[PDB]
């Protein structure tokens, strides 16, 4: 039952991964099915919309009082118009170097998924604004 | 929920922690009860035995084919002679400088706790062989 010390480790773990977004990146959301793992390249999904992460992507790190995690808010991208129509199902992230960093999920606005949406039903030519999206490292 | 890229991300994060043990470290085990978290200060529990982590203690990180985590091989401390006999309850780690990194729990060999014992209670002055020392980091 490992319990990271807040200052000693938690901040280091957050900074090690988050700092690599200082060059910016992109966010891609594709229709399902979600790929098995990030190593698998897109084979039959369709691009719906894309975003970019203004530099810095993340940092500085900070602790979250009264919790088991440390959070570090990042940048606030602008609006993008969908590149297609349908229902958003899955998302992917790429750094300024194009590296597939990680894979998450999307759900309703009350969901705990990676990206919260007013409604997955999206039609081409109607955009939305990125309210917020941050990171948390459980302790 | 998020799935990280093993090569691009996982190894980086895994290495960005255990590298602190390059110049060795120290371990401390106490009888119950266990403190809430590393920030807490040892106040009443009784130390059992002091283990010295060989320098370096761990690393570098490696992938685990056919698995959902990465692995970080660890060093092997020499058997330490216990003081007074005591029932192991919880563990703690202090780096070469003494800074607490994380808390740990105790349990039998089959137990999922990271501290595996041949027998629950250790008699005074009985050196216990070191099972193994490997750290895992989920993909």
């Amino acid at each position: 039952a490992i319990r990271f010390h807040p200052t000693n480790a938690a901040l280091v773990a957050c900074n090690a991964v988050v700092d690599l977004f200082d060059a910016g990146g992109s966010i891609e959301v594709y229709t399902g099915p979600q790929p098995n793992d990030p190593t698998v390249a897109v084979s039959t999904q369709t691009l719906l919309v894309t975003f970019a992460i203004p530099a810095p992507g993340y940092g500085p790190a900070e602790l979250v009082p009264g919790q088991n995690y440390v959070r570090a808010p990042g940048a606030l991208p602008a609006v993008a118009v969908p590149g297609a129509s349908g229902v958003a199902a899955w998302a992917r992230v790429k750094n300024n170097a194009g590296d597939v960093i990680f894979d998450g999920d999307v759900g309703t606005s009350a969901s705990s998924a990676f990206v919260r949406l007013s409604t997955t039903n999206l039609t081409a030519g109607v955009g939305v604004s990125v309210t917020a999206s941050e990171y948390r490292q459980p302790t | 929920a998020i799935r990280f890229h093993p090569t691009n991300a996982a190894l980086v994060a895994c290495n960005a922690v255990v590298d602190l043990f390059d110049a060795g470290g120290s371990i401390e085990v106490y009888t119950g009860p266990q403190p809430n978290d590393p920030t807490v200060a040892v106040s009443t529990q009784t130390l059992l035995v002091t283990f010295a982590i060989p320098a370096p203690g761990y690393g570098p990180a490696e992938l685990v084919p056919g698995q959902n985590y990465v692995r970080a091989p660890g060093a092997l401390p020499a058997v330490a002679v216990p003081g007074a006999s005591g029932v192991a309850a919880w563990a703690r780690v202090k780096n070469n400088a003494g800074d607490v990194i994380f808390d740990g729990d105790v349990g039998t060999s089959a137990s999922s706790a990271f501290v595996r014992l041949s027998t629950t209670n250790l008699t005074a002055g009985v050196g216990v062989s070191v099972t193994a020392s490997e750290y895992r980091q989920p993909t």
Binding site: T31, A88, D105, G107, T119, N121 | -
Partner: protein, 134 residues
């Protein structure tokens, strides 16, 4: 005995889950007999009111008598794929993400490969708000 309120309030909170701002499960079913063929559109349903499908289609179920049937089913909406079902030797698992459903939307199930059996059953579940018309 005054200061009844100190315990009357306790009596009141008990029934404080009246059907307002809450949802109940709604079940959608299917029925297929004597196998199917590949690429077969085996079932659709038109939504009548707003519904939300929990991630991974939690609560959904499949049943059959083959004990050996294999293949894959695609949970399909219009031109978008929302989810699918894995089948292995008569045992099936569900895999998909959360999504919304709206009136005017249409659900569809498409077979991927040919199947042989006597009968198969399928049922999904969704969340609907409780509403009144009076």
């Amino acid at each position: 005995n005054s200061h009844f309120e100190g315990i009357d309030n306790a009596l009141q909170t008990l029934q404080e889950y009246s059907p307002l701002g809450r949802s109940v499960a709604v079940d959608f079913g299917f029925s297929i007999i004597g196998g199917w063929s590949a690429d077969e559109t085996v079932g659709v349903h038109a939504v009548s009111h707003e519904t939300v499908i929990p991630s991974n289609m939690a609560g959904s179920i499949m049943v059959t008598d083959s004990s050996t049937l294999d293949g894959v089913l695609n949970v399909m909406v219009g031109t978008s794929v929302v989810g699918t079902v894995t089948i292995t030797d008569g045992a099936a698992v569900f895999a998909s993400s959360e999504f919304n459903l709206d009136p005017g939307q249409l659900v569809r199930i498409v077979s991927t490969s040919e199947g042989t059996f006597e009968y198969v059953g399928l049922t999904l579940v969704g969340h609907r708000q409780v509403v009144y018309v009076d």
